[PDB]
């Protein structure tokens, strides 16, 4: 047949440079940065327990819920118990925010609270202060916007106005109420907030509030649970999460799991390789995932990313919402969250816990080696399955925030970095997502690693990020990540595909940014680049030359270094390169080399004339793309020697004579774009 003749023929002038326009893609409004990093500087633990005597409101049951910060208060005698609960409560918070001034108030007066709160605002001037209120020993908050504390003698419950309480506490602050009609406090807090705004004409958005209950509701009295149920959820989630798991109907599925085995669970909450730290890690992934999928992006970055303590409180609040729901309680938050209790991801938690503490009989008693959870493996598998047919802007993958959590260990880091690259590849829309979920500071921290297996994966990820957001050149020079890439660009065994990405990364880090130019110059870029300039890869030859060109762009120090290494000489080889991208990249660099002379004597001037005449033999060139850069390059030469070209220009109405004659040929170009740009530069002499 006559089909083999058709398929086997070169289609001339049908490539990217011809079809697409020679123009840069317009950068989108990148809004992924945390435009604020708030910090919770100090904490106020107001505990109104009055250990022993119950308030008149609530009649307690004979067995009853008694545990308060995992302490039976009635075991220890009244006074010691109150100090102990205060001590434990501090410790619990120090898991989440270990570097903050804690200051307890234990069965306080009103004056006592005033002096406490006013002092903490003075210290934490404009940074955030936490106010924790635990009103289990005092009557329920009133309709009139009041919260109860004691008198000096502990003979009368004194009311304290929420108005006065939000006077003493400042603007950026967070309030945690663990008492019975706690919704009333949140209502009345917002009322007095509106009331202050009306008085100000002739602290709302700043103030976050978490509350154990809706205004009508009462806290549960159930003997299995703590009294401190909300505080417990916020501040020790894994402990109640496991105790709650053992109270549900789903325990039938794991026989030999009582509450007593949960007490004796091995591990710590830091060590992710232990059993307890496994769960703690999984839990952090699950809650941070539920939040990201359920909340609008704005409100997510406000609560789950700005500051650690708030983010920890809201992560753990989602668990409170789930647990307390099962006892006719609805927790309340000030920036109101939509209901997460029925999110699918909770079924993943249930299974994760189940599998983890089905092992406890054998881990404790037999002394069996703790097998790790399949959680993170399977979640990466889901993320992978999404990518297969996930080429589109459809629903984004649920697992992005889990992929982030996996980077933190080493166990699944290689696989995640692979998948994350595969995801980032899909398009710049994806790189935007991955920056919004908060991948940036972890991907940047891995540049401190020496594990050589990461090098091809991180190089890939960073090329994708910097292709979208070029402002990250600021961050990479600060942390000395610019050294990480320099090493990869001077490594013969690293593939030429990845060395090309690396050369691009350096050409972005260096681009019009003296801090990055001075840093890469000292990391010996010019010597490294020249070693790879004659590679058998036309993309690498291209980028290495752009990279070389950018480093001495308006930077005389990198030019002098180029003269010693004799870079301009080694770049003349690229002027007769087959690929017209490379020829252009070479012309770019030799032009950028010429432009930053700063009026120096015979050494610099004699070099510019050698670079002039070498460019001046790319007039009769096939690509107009090369010829445009050839004009732009000779533009830099004209700007530098403007006094000399005025002599040549005024005459016809011998080096400069030659370069002006070149621009006349480029002015009378067949191609319109080259004739235009040549005409502009030629008229700015005229």
């Amino acid at each position: 047949e006559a089909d083999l003749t058709d398929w086997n023929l070169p289609l001339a002038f049908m490539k990217k440079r011809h079809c697409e326009k020679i123009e840069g893609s317009k950068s989108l409004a990148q809004s992924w940065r945390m435009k604020d990093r708030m910090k919770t500087v100090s904490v106020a633990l107001v505990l109104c327990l009055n250990v022993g005597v119950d308030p008149p409101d609530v009649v307690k049951t004979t067995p009853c819920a008694r545990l308060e910060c995992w302490i039976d208060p009635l075991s220890m005698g009244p006074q010691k118990a109150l100090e102990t609960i205060g001590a434990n409560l501090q410790k619990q918070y120090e898991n989440w925010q270990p570097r903050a001034r804690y200051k307890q108030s234990l069965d306080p007066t009103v004056d006592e609270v005033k002096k406490l709160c006013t002092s903490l605002r003075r210290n934490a001037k404009e940074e955030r202060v936490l106010f924790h209120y635990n009103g289990h020993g005092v009557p329920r908050p009133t309709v009139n916007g009041e919260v109860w504390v004691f008198n000096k003698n502990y003979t009368q419950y004194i009311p304290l106005s929420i108005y006065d309480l939000q006077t003493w506490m400042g603007s950026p602050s967070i309030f945690v109420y663990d008492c019975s009609n706690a919704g009333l406090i949140v209502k009345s807090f917002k009322q007095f907030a509106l009331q202050r705004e009306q008085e100000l004409e002739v602290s709302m958005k700043n103030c976050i509030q978490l509350a154990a209950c809706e205004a009508t509701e009462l806290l549960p009295m159930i003997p299995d649970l703590p009294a401190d149920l909300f505080t417990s959820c916020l501040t020790t989630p894994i402990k109640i999460a496991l105790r709650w798991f053992c109270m549900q109907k789903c325990v039938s599925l794991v026989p030999g799991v009582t509450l007593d085995l949960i007490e004796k669970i091995p591990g710590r909450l830091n060590d992710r390789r232990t059993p307890l730290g496994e769960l703690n890690w999984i839990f952090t992934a699950i809650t941070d995932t539920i939040a990201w999928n359920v909340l609008p992006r704005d409100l997510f970055q406000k609560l789950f990313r700005q500051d650690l303590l708030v983010a920890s409180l809201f992560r753990n609040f989602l668990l409170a919402e789930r647990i307390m729901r099962s006892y006719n309680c609805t927790p309340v938050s000030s920036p109101r969250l939509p209901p997460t209790y029925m999110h699918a991801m909770w079924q993943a938690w249930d299974l994760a816990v189940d599998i983890c503490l089905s092992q406890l009989p054998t881990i404790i008693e037999e002394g069996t080696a703790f097998r790790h959870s399949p959680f993170f493996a399977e979640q990466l598998t889901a993320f992978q399955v999404w990518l297969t047919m996930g080429v589109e802007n459809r629903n984004p993958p649920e697992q992005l925030p889990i992929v982030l959590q996996v980077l933190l260990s080493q166990v699944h880091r290689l696989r995640a970095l692979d998948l994350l690259g595969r995801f980032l590849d899909l398009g710049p829309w994806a790189v935007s997502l991955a920056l919004s979920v908060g991948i940036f500071p972890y991907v940047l921290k891995l540049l401190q690693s020496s594990a050589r297996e990461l090098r091809p994966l991180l190089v890939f990820i960073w090329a994708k990020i910097l292709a979208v957001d070029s402002s990250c050149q600021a961050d990479l020079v600060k942390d000395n990540g610019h050294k990480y890439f320099l090493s990869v660009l001077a490594d013969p065994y690293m593939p030429a595909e990845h060395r090309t990405m690396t050369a691009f990364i350096l050409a972005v880090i260096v681009n019009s940014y003296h801090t990055g130019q001075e840093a890469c110059l000292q990391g010996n870029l010019i010597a490294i680049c020249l070693e790879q300039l004659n590679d058998p890869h036309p993309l690498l030859r291209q980028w290495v030359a752009i990279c070389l060109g950018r480093i001495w762009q308006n930077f005389d120090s990198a030019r002098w270094c180029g003269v010693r290494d004799s870079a301009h000489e080694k770049l003349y080889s690229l002027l007769s390169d087959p690929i017209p991208e490379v020829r252009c990249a070479a012309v770019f660099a030799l032009g950028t080399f010429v432009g930053n002379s700063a009026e120096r004597t015979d050494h610099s001037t004699t070099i510019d004339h050698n670079v002039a005449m070498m460019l001046a033999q790319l007039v009769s060139d096939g690509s107009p793309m090369v010829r445009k850069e050839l004009v732009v390059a000779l533009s830099h030469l004209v700007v530098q020697y403007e006094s000399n070209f005025c002599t040549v220009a005024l005459q016809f109405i011998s080096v400069y004579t030659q370069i002006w004659r070149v621009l006349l040929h480029l002015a009378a170009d067949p191609y319109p774009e080259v004739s235009d740009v040549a005409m502009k530069v030629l008229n700015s002499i005229a």
């Binding site: 830091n270 952090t284 990313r305 650690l308 983010a311 982030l404 959590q405 980077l407 933190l408 260990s409 080493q410 908060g438 500071p441 972890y442 921290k445 891995l446 401190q448 690693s449």
Partner: peptide, 8 residues
């Protein structure tokens, strides 16, 4: 000073 603990 990062949010989650990374062990590089």
């Amino acid at each position: 000073e990062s949010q989650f603990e990374m062990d590089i």
